[PDB]
Symmetry: D2
Subunit: 226 residues, 4 copies
């Protein structure tokens, strides 16, 4: 059992200790489509250095979670190759931005399950015993079995890493928080298409006594786990 | 009977090129004393009520336009069962830390408890018969409610969002609806937050990647479209 | 106090070998005039109310035992918003075809509408403060409600089911809970149906494949385990 | 291109008076060796496979008719992630009690595990590209899946149900769909159960209260309505 994390705006978690038997690290969408050359985000013309800066810090947190025996869950955003799970508005916006879901680029069909751009990057590769969530939306709970995996393991606390801070990570945090999960978001293990959106996404969590949970740097988590 | 697109950011809304009132709902989120009035939850935490109240008059004019065109209208209230059976202990603990514990007695009764004066919808945007009210225990209006059943029964595909706050309840509801494939518009002058920088960032987040959560617009741009049949 | 297993079909319930009141809820499903009283929905369709009412007094004895042991108690009411925004058109059409249209005026007010006399919980099993009531628009108590939030907030893992009808609202709620991993017991003498053969078949369906939906028991065997 | 009602119990189905293939899906539930073939889960528990297999050839004729009319077709497989992360401990314990533990090795590989021979859809009703397959960890096809997203994206309002077993996976899926407002038909000769009395009672339960869960029909009456 571990102590609290020095976090914003309260010492996390609210109940005063971290139990690996009730805590999961979530790694959200570390895929070429969100952080690598030739994928979805690169094809739209965004700066990949903003999404990639969280990769090596995430690998150090993943190693700490594995050493403490906490649950580890990974997510991949993606669609059935027949696109039966693709809403027409999501498709139309991706075409408007110059990177249509299902269209072929340097890393295969954009955001399609089984394609090279959709795979988890090797810097944070999963291992046996770490379930992978395949989500068709931004939030990892909707149209998945994530809540069943968490409730079966008795998980009450989540530590969030991955990309992007303001889209998939924030949506997943908001979904978990409404169900009563106690959530921490790591500031140096997340990133966005705009630095001001990354910073605003983190400061939004801290209002009203910690409306969505708390924020911390990975250094503050690693100090609590040591 | 069908209306043109809205001049919106970052695309002319909606994506399918017209607004049909038979398939469109206006959502009014949490226009309650607890979020925008003296003596409630937000006031007791020490935030500036002028930031949350400025969207009330514009919302009333959009509500009038929705009623005139025969759109669906749905209202939401955040709040808890008086026995607090729907209150997660972390939500309760943070509200106490912020100096406004849910269920504690203040100037407007028990904070965020269903049936209390602070929890009522303010009269400037009072519901009418035929405009369902959602009682939500969380920030998103879909979780632990019948909202998705009400929308699917009426054949709703498109949502127009107003209410408070931009970055918490409104954004959570927009993200939930968007993942299910609803086409959503958020009105910039009919929403507000505890911090102006968070209000502005919440709107600009919508506009990335071709409109990742939908589009943004001023109520003037919506009212112009609702005076232009095609 | 922690209690031993219940003599149940097809295994001594529950699977994990003890009953902890801190993690167990008694659910009372739809004990309303619309399902078990004169002038309501079920009476207006022409079904025999003695089939649905026989479980009322046994349910009151189990409710007393649940309150004595400090277990969670949750009640359900099936019903609709007065504006009928939560009423699917197929559910409405079938209720009209059966001679008891939802929302139509009958001897106990508008049929299956929230706030109407026929919709109230009957006094034999009146709720107490601290026993949450679920308002469900469907047969299953989880769909379009906050039930799963109430159960997870209290740390509930085990459910004991009573109420009506065995084959419709009770079975649908049991199937929904079971898929989420809740461990469920259905009481044979505290439930009932519009047809006795459907009541008996609904109970036997639970018992297949090692207890596919949980187990069945008589209230006497639950009260024996609780030492009442 | 729009079809008339099916002669069904207890009303001519559907309630709105016609069948539009653009808004209708045929669901094939759990036609797997684990539920209907030698060496699988149901066989290892000692139940009579002739009761679950009798609906296979009628189902194949209905699948051919659905393909000809351009209806949506959706298939389901019950089963678990190979790491068993989606397996509740009560489900596991009961399967061991019944002598067929989920994840244990039997004649067709690991019982109810995704990717194993006993878990595959049997060839008589093999899926085709553009007929989505649901992998469900529970009895109801909606819980912990993307089924509701697939149906709402296609504009589906009406469901025709086939598969096994009548009283477990088929009934649970019918009850879940009905509460959301889907209009459902269950085919009596394209379903089956571990007990014939449970099959018959599961069909009769649908028919009460003016059709509380929908209606029942024979394949013959559906194929007559489709022409």
């Amino acid at each position: 059992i571990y102590s609290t994390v020095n976090a914003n705006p309260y010492a996390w978690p609210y109940d005063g200790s971290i139990d690996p038997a009730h805590t999961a690290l979530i790694l959200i969408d570390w895929q070429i489509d969100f952080c690598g050359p030739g994928g979805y985000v690169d094809s739209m013309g965004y700066d990949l250095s903003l999404t990639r800066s969280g990769l090596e810090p995430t690998a150090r947190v993943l190693a700490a979670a594995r050493d403490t025996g906490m649950t580890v869950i990974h997510t991949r955003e993606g669609h059935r190759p027949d696109l039966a799970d693709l809403p027409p508005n999501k498709r139309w916006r991706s075409a408007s931005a110059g990177a249509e879901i299902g269209s072929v680029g340097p890393c295969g069909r954009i955001l399609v399950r089984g394609e090279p751009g959709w795979e988890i990057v090797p810097e944070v590769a999963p291992r046996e015993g770490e379930p992978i969530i395949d989500k068709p939306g931004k939030g990892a709970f909707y149209a998945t079995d994530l809540d069943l995996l968490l409730r079966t393991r008795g998980i009450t606390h989540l530590i969030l890493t991955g990309i992007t801070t303001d889209v998939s990570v924030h949506t997943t945090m908001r979904e978990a928080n409404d169900r009563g999960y106690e959530c921490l978001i790591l500031s140096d293990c997340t990133g966005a298409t705009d630095r001001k959106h990354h910073e605003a996404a983190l400061s939004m969590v801290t209002m009203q006594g910690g409306v969505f949970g708390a924020t911390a740097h990975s250094d503050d988590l690693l100090a609590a786990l040591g």
